């Protein structure tokens, strides 16, 4: 499929696609943009998670959420690749946020799919 890319969407912007090679590799700055756009993927989807209807919700917006339960599936690996290489504490504690958040989203998602599928 397609490389990730940024697109608008009623509830902000996703980043979702492939990731390229570089996103999460090794300036920590590079990798707080590339961490913050993962947060900005899993709040979208926590959102929708919040306010679909399992059963009832429009299919374009069932498709917008599988594209972010993949690319979030993908960024989780990233994150957890990355966590042993960083020796920074605070992009360290950051990471491990971002992880639980991951793990929170993925298992209200499990919650979501059940209701859609019986």
Partial sequence: GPMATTVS???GPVYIG???QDFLRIQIGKLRSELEMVSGNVRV???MLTELVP???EPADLELLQELNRT???MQQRVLELIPQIA???LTEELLIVNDNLNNVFLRH???ERFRTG
Avoid: D, K
């Fill in 88 to 90: 920074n504490e605070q």
């Fill in 55 to 57: 059963t009832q919700a």
């Fill in 110 to 112: 499990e919650r979501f």
């Fill in 45 to 47: 989807m926590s959102e």
């Fill in 18 to 20: 492939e990731l390229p």
């Fill in 72 to 74: 979030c599936r993908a």
């Fill in 9 to 11: 969407t009623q509830r």
